[PDB]
Symmetry: D2
Subunit: 461 residues, 4 copies
Amino acid sequence: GFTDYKVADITLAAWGRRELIIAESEMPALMGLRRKYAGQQPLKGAKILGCIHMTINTGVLIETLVALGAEVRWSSCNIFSTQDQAAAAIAAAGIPVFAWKGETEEEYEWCIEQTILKDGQPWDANMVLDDGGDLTEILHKKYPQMLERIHGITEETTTGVHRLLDMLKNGTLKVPAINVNDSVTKSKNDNKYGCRHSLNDAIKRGTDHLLSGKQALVIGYGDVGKGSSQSLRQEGMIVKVAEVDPICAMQACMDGFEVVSPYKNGINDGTEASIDAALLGKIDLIVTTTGNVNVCDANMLKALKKRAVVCNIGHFDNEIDTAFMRKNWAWEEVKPQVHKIHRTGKDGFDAHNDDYLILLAEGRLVNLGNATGHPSRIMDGSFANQVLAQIHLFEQKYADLPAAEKAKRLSVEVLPKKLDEEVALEMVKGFGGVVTQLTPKQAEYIGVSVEGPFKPDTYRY
Amino acid sequence: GFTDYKVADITLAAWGRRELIIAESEMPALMGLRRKYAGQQPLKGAKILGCIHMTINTGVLIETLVALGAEVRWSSCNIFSTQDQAAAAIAAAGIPVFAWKGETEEEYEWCIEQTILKDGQPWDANMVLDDGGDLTEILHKKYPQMLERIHGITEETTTGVHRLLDMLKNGTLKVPAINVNDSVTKSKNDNKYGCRHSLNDAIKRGTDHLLSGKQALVIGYGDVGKGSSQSLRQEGMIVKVAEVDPICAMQACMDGFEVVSPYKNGINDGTEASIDAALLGKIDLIVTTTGNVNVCDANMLKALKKRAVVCNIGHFDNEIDTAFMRKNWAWEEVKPQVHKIHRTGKDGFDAHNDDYLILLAEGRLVNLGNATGHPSRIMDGSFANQVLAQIHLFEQKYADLPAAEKAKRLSVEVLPKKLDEEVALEMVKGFGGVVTQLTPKQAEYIGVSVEGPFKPDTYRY
Amino acid sequence: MTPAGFTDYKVADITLAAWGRRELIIAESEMPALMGLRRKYAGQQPLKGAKILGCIHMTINTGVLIETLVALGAEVRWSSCNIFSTQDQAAAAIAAAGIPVFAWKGETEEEYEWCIEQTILKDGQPWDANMVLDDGGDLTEILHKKYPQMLERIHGITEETTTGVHRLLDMLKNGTLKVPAINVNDSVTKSKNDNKYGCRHSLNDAIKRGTDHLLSGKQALVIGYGDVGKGSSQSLRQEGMIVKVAEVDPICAMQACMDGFEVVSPYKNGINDGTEASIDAALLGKIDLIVTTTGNVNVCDANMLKALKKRAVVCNIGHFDNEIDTAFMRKNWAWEEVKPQVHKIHRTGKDGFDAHNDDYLILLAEGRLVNLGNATGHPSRIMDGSFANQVLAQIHLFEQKYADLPAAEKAKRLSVEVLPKKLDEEVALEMVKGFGGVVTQLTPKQAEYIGVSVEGPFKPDTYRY
Amino acid sequence: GFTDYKVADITLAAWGRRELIIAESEMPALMGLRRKYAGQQPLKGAKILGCIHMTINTGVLIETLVALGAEVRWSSCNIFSTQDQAAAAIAAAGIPVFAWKGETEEEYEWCIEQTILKDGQPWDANMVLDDGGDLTEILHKKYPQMLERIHGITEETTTGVHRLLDMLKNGTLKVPAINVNDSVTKSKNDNKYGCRHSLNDAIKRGTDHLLSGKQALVIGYGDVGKGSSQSLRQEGMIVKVAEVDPICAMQACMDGFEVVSPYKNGINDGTEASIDAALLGKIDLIVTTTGNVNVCDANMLKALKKRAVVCNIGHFDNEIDTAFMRKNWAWEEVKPQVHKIHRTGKDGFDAHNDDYLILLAEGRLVNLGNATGHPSRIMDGSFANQVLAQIHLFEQKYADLPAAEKAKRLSVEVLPKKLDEEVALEMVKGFGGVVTQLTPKQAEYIGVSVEGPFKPDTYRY
Ligand SMILES: NC(=O)c1ccc[n+]([C@@H]2O[C@H](COP(=O)([O-])OP(=O)(O)OC[C@H]3O[C@@H](n4cnc5c(N)ncnc54)[C@H](O)[C@@H]3O)[C@@H](O)[C@H]2O)c1
Ligand SMILES: NC(=O)c1ccc[n+]([C@@H]2O[C@H](COP(=O)([O-])OP(=O)(O)OC[C@H]3O[C@@H](n4cnc5c(N)ncnc54)[C@H](O)[C@@H]3O)[C@@H](O)[C@H]2O)c1
Ligand SMILES: NC(=O)c1ccc[n+]([C@@H]2O[C@H](COP(=O)([O-])OP(=O)(O)OC[C@H]3O[C@@H](n4cnc5c(N)ncnc54)[C@H](O)[C@@H]3O)[C@@H](O)[C@H]2O)c1
Ligand SMILES: NC(=O)c1ccc[n+]([C@@H]2O[C@H](COP(=O)([O-])OP(=O)(O)OC[C@H]3O[C@@H](n4cnc5c(N)ncnc54)[C@H](O)[C@@H]3O)[C@@H](O)[C@H]2O)c1
Ligand SMILES: Nc1ncnc2c1ncn2[C@@H]1O[C@H](CO)[C@@H](O)[C@H]1O
């Protein structure tokens, strides 16, 4: 008589279990942690509030935390990212999950609240696993008493880490965090190669458009922008890249991209006259990758080529000015997470109007909204880091330290390089890769241990 | 009556000047520093011992240092890297240079000694520019009194920085250094994209071999290994990558390379039995990128496919066991910097023997030995960093500080991110790239200044 | 629906029609050659009186083809040429427009044959068909074997695909072909567009939808390096797969080598003597993904399937399901459906499986065309070329009126032909303009210098592109 | 006492022999023909006038024809294409060769004349091997008596075949020809993949310019244009493609190139107004691939970005209007086969002028002029076809046929597909490729013989 969940359709559970059993075979670092630590139960007593895309891959993470002794209460960090069969499989395993694909904003907030509360009272939570910081922010604003008993936060993504670092700077962060994002086996795996796999995937599922020989503008050339640019270029798109960071821009040039600004001489003065109308008039696809606000603004949307596709693979819905499009233009649903945005006006539209844009996932994460996000073998690295970060912070028991000792441990930190390397090795073995062992003379020659770490913490890979 | 130089052929000077004038047009960051600092003469009174590849690109660096007020005495850091027309053009400008292509080891040492000594006595040197640490080591071992008057070292390359850091750890480093290598506009420009341009270049000039559809083994997947692997794969080579670092190996896998070891299960126990003879029997091209010793060892060389090409783009000549090949096998010169190594024995060889390897540049830096190394537009970034580093250390005047103040400034440092970004922006403008400017709201949203820096010092790009 | 009381169709779900119409309106904007033909020929109605039996994948793209034929004056009766290729929203939109269509995703073999029969028969009697549009030759074969009298009134066949063309040429050689045909496949704007670039787009698409597997850094074996093999190999290599290519044609193998692929055989020294000992078990033990592209039989045979790495994906993008020995797998191994068109094939035996068994293969679309079975096949802008050629071929054969010729005149016109290069060039130009491409015009001096007309054709018929 | 040759320097012979011995190991189809036909001497009595680039690769062809019993007299078909060490090695083998790198037009004609005449009288020639048709045209215009006794022409290249077909159409062709170009193992090997290898090679040797991130315009998208486009794109160039053939243009689009015209709406009026000044103002590199005339015209050259590189990889130097540049602009030699073309005027230039173009190989074949042309393993296919074509026409003995029988055999033909496949198989084995054999059932199923041919003559590959 387990009822402590809310999912689209519990009857999808058997399908979800079939997909979990396949995904496990794609996730050797995660399954290795299960086999290694199952006996020791290092998360026994851990009670984890989890807020991350309720996908099959997240399912393998959840069941790894549970297999290591954790109890969890789970929600999605995005209204469109859930795989309903994954959510069903987790609910049917007796794990509290509050997630479905196509939540309203009200339902999204209700789902997070259902993780925080059990039977109408704060759950005895002592750990947080977050993606983007929404759960972190709700706990700090609304449930500070709960944070007193929480040993730490493990934060998945660039945007969430930024929000943690703001809180640390302002003296408002109440518990230590591990920045899972900045593991090399996360940032330079998931952020880059995940988006390389999943961006063209989502655009194909959403539009089935030929990409080869068409014009893309990728806004950003960080990890996600690099992966996104490659996703499109490898399909034969002609990709132009926009950046504010000259080092990232230099990388775009050397990687064989033309670096352009949507604005004349790169100056965004907020006027239509500032828009390079000739450039935007030629673009078939714009992708936002920034973690920033209004990088595809109203004036850019007005200037875009007719029938251009617009999408966002970085954070929230405000990289693209969707608020402007809701206020001014008529939305025609093609199918779920695909809208034609008719630039002819707000009230009606002509079914045969040629002056529209195609918006994917209403400007939310396109890879998860219009496809299934990163593949298992990539998320294996991110999620092995999550499990190790949960173990580290849980075992440190911050909430049980004296005030003086808390002051010294209240930080946002990355996992040590040795763990990053061990996750990498399990990932390499999953490809059938064979890593060479240094000889003693070779290890002495370059000044490292035969078992590593092989690089100083300053190394950028 | 200028005679304070030694070059192959002074009559090549006019040709060298023609090539310097073209190279200047490819090096906007360097020529920007000339225009910026020429008036102020920030290196007036600087007396720079330089030891770096006497190429056309090094020529533009030398003339930038001189245009900012430096005097220099110059040698090459490699016996095969000099462009004789570049050396001639620098000598013809009245700058002391001791460099030619195809030096002996004795001539190499003599050339460095001719920079250190002027008219049989130590030069009144006060700055060092080094590539690989040979000049740095000679000053510390043989001329320690000269280091009393030296304000600093600016070190070009990964291997040289390793040697500096050993000296710092052991308390044997006598003057502060700038690690130029670990600027992003050096390491993730020069080390990677330089080798992408110049490795297939050198292999074509040396062998004219088709690379498409043939089998390569790249030992190492650091910045040089990454660029080297792309150099070959973009030509259609089937590239396998060897690594000791599982994170680098993980990147090789994600980049679409098979990761293999020369040794069964990656264990080099020193025996022939440990060699994967089946793997090495299929390899047409082996490239070493490691900075390590004996990564292409005698047993690997014995097991390699007949008529395989062997080359090193890392350091020294000891990445490949060339000593074993000189001791055991007969060398037939095809043309300069190309030898057939006859595995039939040491004494004679049959002109028609089928059992040989092709060694490029006698196992020394293949890009500079068999071609012209990195292109001007790439070296522009490295050398803009060198000039800014020379300015910083010269203006700090370490050698004139009291003992107490020296103790605090005796360090190996990178340039600030802000300077790295300024070099990057000049490089981007040379591609016709346009960097977007953040709005105040956007800069506040992601927590950076509109002027940058745009990333924390932890950012890996 | 549209027509009062219309019931002359069978589709999965008529309520998908509005959705299908939304997708047709988008696809039209991606298909300028096809929409150009509509605008050009609408007034002239060159297919007025044409009654076309069509058998091709009932996709959104096929929907734009059908409505082009109807806009030019044709009546049609339509079925899919594959049990898994139909997009049910496309089928619904076509039925709702009052066009007879018999197609759904996930037909049985019985349902497949019934659907073709429903195009051929109207109210239980042969339709007064006078044209055939076919993809793979099944409808062509049924008319020749079962309804020869209907071919007396048929002016021509226009055939989409390599396999169908092969079957037409066998019929011509054997003197059994009863009406002339246009080989649409061998337009350059078909073969070297659709067969290659279509598969480049749609193969990795179908593998992602079907498995969501990371391809980067994993090992693929592509069997074949014709147009489909070339496009398939690029689909995987551009994702970072380590692709090995098998071929029987040394010229295609040479192209694979030059394109940067290792050319290997499943069999030692390339000799398939039918023994297990002939299988290169070491090579197949390393393969994560096998793709068949040949149009040939048993190119991924039982012994190869036995030797494949555990949890390898197996799929076919060649026109029929016998490229892989699926019959051997149905006979010997237990099939576990993951989801539609995805099965785990448990090599532990026939009767039952352990849910947690590690010794299985993943088969996509039960060995049938994987791009159409697990995704949506080629994109609109590619199918535009193929389908512009189909419309031109239909116009040509319908206007020639073969069925109304005297016996002596028929003998001379009974052939399998391609469209003239000038039409191939005109399709290509409309495709280029859809990319915003600008084709240069030769000067008179330049046209004289290379010996062509300023208007083309620009190449002799021998040119291979 | 062998003196029947003219080369740059006979002392280069030993070096040329070293390179021939290596090149043989890269050319298994050619070396296979030697082993197969040695004993049978199928070219015994053949006396071949050869006119093709006197490269190392051509050396292996010559020595194959000689090993099969031919005598030859050889010249280059290009003033810049000879490798002087190859010419020396062939002369030192007692083979008449008249070729050096850097011929004048007068020297070029004299060299062809020295093949045609022996001791001041027509040689007893009975076979012609040609590349571009210059020798073929001289024989038809000036030596028709010699053509009476010639059994055939084997023609290497697209331009030469066009010239043969015009002669056949006009009834002026006097002997049958094999179109060696349209073997698949020639056209879709040499013309495409050869240029992919050798175009970026020649641009690097000639300029050492970084190509990554820079803008290229490739005029033409035939076999050479396809390979040239890839040569640049694989290096990271942003490649735009021009074409007059909409099918080739369609292929460029699908291959992921933007298709542009130098002229507004593609219409060349002959006026400056017709030039797209904005487009040409952004181009760093223009490459002509057409076999057509004035496809990089005077107005395009005037509009090109300052310091753009201009080159031609089509068979003759009239693709670029070099005549306009000789008439109007000052040429500064950088080094052999590299000129700065100063757009400031005809009589003198400022050494520091910024307004110049860089022209490679004075507008002649850039791959052979500035590098070594196609690699051995590619030329192996072309030259295996040449040998089989020489055998076929020599054995047919056209010159000895009655007039009635000649009339029936006077044609321009390709080799049978079966021979194309046999060359391909030897090329594949040189990669270590393993071709599968059809079963009898499989062969019957697709309607071919187990031993081929595998495709109908209509197949395009
Ligand atoms: N969809 C996914 O699966 C996925 C994967 C990982 C991360 N993310 C999200 O993607 C976003 C980016 O993450 P990242 O790791 O690449 O961060 P990053 O800091 O590496 O890169 C972001 C880049 O955006 C650039 N940028 C900022 N404002 C810009 C503007 N106005 N114009 C142009 N460029 C601008 C910055 O200079 C920076 O290089 C974040 O929101 C992150 O959480 C999503
Ligand atoms: N030739 C040039 O123009 C050029 C350019 C820059 C740097 N370099 C030189 O290249 C070398 C590498 O530079 P880098 O910046 O790539 O350094 P790096 O540390 O980034 O990369 C070296 C890599 O070698 C790997 N490695 C070490 N021992 C190995 C072994 N036994 N087998 C396999 N892999 C092994 C390490 O794990 C590391 O990832 C240095 O010697 C550097 O000075 C040369
Ligand atoms: N799925 C799609 O959307 C799509 C696209 C177009 C064509 N097709 C089908 O794809 C198939 C191939 O079409 P194509 O145009 O590429 O034909 P093709 O003749 O160009 O290529 C087929 C290749 O298979 C090779 N081959 C034959 N037997 C082989 C064997 N035993 N092992 C290895 N290679 C072998 C041949 O040598 C040939 O090169 C046909 O069935 C065609 O109808 C499907
Ligand atoms: N340098 C070498 O090693 C090498 C190799 C092989 C062939 N070639 C020569 O290269 C040339 C091309 O050979 P190919 O086999 O590619 O010929 P091709 O006919 O295959 O290609 C030439 C292309 O140029 C296009 N073209 C013609 N005029 C044009 C114009 N004004 N603007 C744009 N495009 C135009 C044509 O449409 C055609 O597609 C010939 O001269 C051939 O002999 C040189
Ligand atoms: N398939 C997936 N399952 C779960 N999380 C994912 C998936 N794909 C991407 N993500 C995560 O989404 C985050 C952005 O919210 C990224 O940091 C990435 O780690």
